[model samples]
Target chain A: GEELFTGVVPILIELDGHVNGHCFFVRGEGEGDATIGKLSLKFIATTGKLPVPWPTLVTTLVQCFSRYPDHMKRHDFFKSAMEGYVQERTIYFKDDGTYKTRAEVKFEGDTLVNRIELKGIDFKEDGNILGHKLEYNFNSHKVYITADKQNNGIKANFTIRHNVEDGSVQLADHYQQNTPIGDGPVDLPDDHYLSTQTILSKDLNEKRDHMVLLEYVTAAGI
Target chain B: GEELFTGVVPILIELDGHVNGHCFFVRGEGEGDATIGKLSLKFIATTGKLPVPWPTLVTTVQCFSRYPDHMKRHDFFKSAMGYVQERTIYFKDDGTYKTRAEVKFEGDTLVNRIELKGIDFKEDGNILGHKLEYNFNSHKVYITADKQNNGIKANFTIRHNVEDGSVQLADHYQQNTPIGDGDLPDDHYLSTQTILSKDLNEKRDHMVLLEYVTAAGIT
Candidate 1:
């Protein structure tokens, strides 16, 4: 019920269940492959082949890390890949009713290459997902995203995609040179996400994602 | 080779093996008994019948605290009464050394005890003739004196009649506020006195002397 993807790469995901859902990708101008806006949707999408069957939170993270092992090794690549441009970040809830807004951010030569910004994320007292809306700007592509609680899952909506190249270079430079790393958004990927995952579970006394993934990997024999 | 006595209380002294020596007590105007200036000379003095024989540094501290036990229990009594009398001057071939001292006083009763200041005493070189300065001005006794023998020096200032006796005796072991205030000094090898006293040896490593006052708490 969780997902992980890149801001630039076209990582296809699919789910196997009796459900009414549709998934698609829209490619920006000057881009060859299609890139999906909603990662949770990709987890439920049909990729024609290589589908992400029976997706879970830990499985999604494993798939992302496994598919892009080489790119994910780079300390900065996990946040934003060089070739794939996968901004890999995590989103997990806390028992205290507050969740950290994790985003995948990248920097090349002191310049921001990719990042995501979230706003208006609300949850119910019973720990149900009320809904959350976010804005993502990777390179020159901008998209507004929203997720609503529905049927023990989230129904996500990615809106307002635009290829605005006017301030891409300048804005990225400002974030790189002027802004501090942890000021606006928290970007962590791969190992950092694993560390965060373990700590979050310990803090909230929740089931650890590490053990869940370990069980999944052992049973799958891969 | 060590000694102890009071700055006020007159104690008579007698040296048995001494070839020649002189000891006396001069009473201030209104007192029934007289007192002397030289502290080392007082060690040989008699406190009536119970005399401290073959006195050592530790024994001297015990003698002073015992006689004034009734008068010296106050918090302010420790400092003036507390002293570390170190002597570097050697006995001659005949086991004798020339020593003399004089004191000028005013008060009818002396409540403050004699105390030596500074951390340690060192005596180096020879002093056939050396000048010492000790004066009383407005109830404050100031001493700027130096003693040298055996490659060490003792330059000390004895500040007396201080209203607040909070300053700790700079014992080599650093037992600051006597024996019942706080934890003992961290250094034990340096605190050899605790080793000699079997009672103190138990808590030598972690002694709390802040609560227990001792007769030998001078240093």
Candidate 2:
């Protein structure tokens, strides 16, 4: 049997053993299919949960895309993934009568962080601001992030990448998975037990701007 | 050339004043891609609307069936009228963990006076009830029914005729094209603008069921 591994990728920023700030990726493509494919990872940096509850945040990311790969493989890999609480809604801008498209995943359960809206965005530049790019400001967040994925990873860019649809700069690629924990730092925690091996790009000294959650599922039967 | 008409028998009753009820038939072959021989007629049991408004009660009966002679036309004719709106629903049992099945159409959206609900077939009678809903619901008003080329029209049993897959029934037939001042009589309605016919049998005034559905382009 071919080794089929598919699940969520939960990225974390570590400070004193605390996993903070996260994003998700729901992807499916086996080596049997595409030899190697890159996936896009996006998040709004400026607006997020205050002192974001990393525990609850990580759990939310896992629960959202939890059963996708399993269901896909079970159902003959034809059409995988439960939509979770996502519904299909189309927005037709009455102006010029052309509709603006968006693929939204809203949180519907009883909780504070009940919605994650990913609006179509394009990036723009503002010479007046300290940052070179002007990113999306939703519900009012000063710093936002818009990212595009490649080779299962993203390049760390300090000056923020802009959105292609709506003008906005990306503050981070929260969609990245696993961050490198320096050499010989091997004290295990529950979260660490679940943490994936982070593959770092050769350049380490440059302020690592973004981290993606790849291979978040810990080894089975260990 | 000898013209062959294949169709379902018309159900005539006392209450609705004319023939009514829709039945489906097939000509070509296979479940989904058969040619529609002919639609019997729009039989409105009561004043109600059909699903497809414009084609409301308007069924495109395919007219492309080829038979050796009109005598062996009962199989195609019976299949056309027997399979219209035939559906089944399955539910799981909570206690025993078995399954149950119901096959029939019911409710006001279908036919008003008649409905096929609670149809049980098991021997123990552990399921529900089953009965046929019917009546002659045709009208005195007449609409022009033009026969399409490469199509067919055959008249079948005027009553509920169950067609098991392999069994075939033989029937007598006739064809007539007499236009009238007001409306054609119930007997003359289907065959009046006659395209094809076959010998039919059953009680003369026996309630006939008219059903015709295109084997192609239905669903």
All DockQ scores: 0.00, 0.01
Here, model 2's chain A TM-score works out at 0.22
Displacement of the residue B72 alpha carbon in candidate 1, Å: 63
Encode model 2's per-residue lDDT on B8-100: one tens digit a residue. Answer: 222221111111111111111111111333333223222232111111111112212222233233223222221222112221220011111
**lDDT digits (tens) for residues A1-222 of candidate 2:** 012213222222211111111122221111111111112222222212212211112212221221223212221111121122222222221111111111222212321111222221222223212122222221111211111132211111111222322453333222222111122121211210111221212124423232232222221112
Candidate 2 residue spans exceeding 4 A from truth: A1-222, B1-53, B60-75, B79-219
lDDT of 1 by residue, A126-152 (tens): 322221111112212211112112211
Show model 1 residue runs off by greater than 4 Å.
Answer: A1-80, A83-102, A105-120, A127-211, A214-222, B1-219
| Local error of candidate 1 at residue A71 (angstroms) | 19
- TM-scores of the models, in the order given: 0.14, 0.16
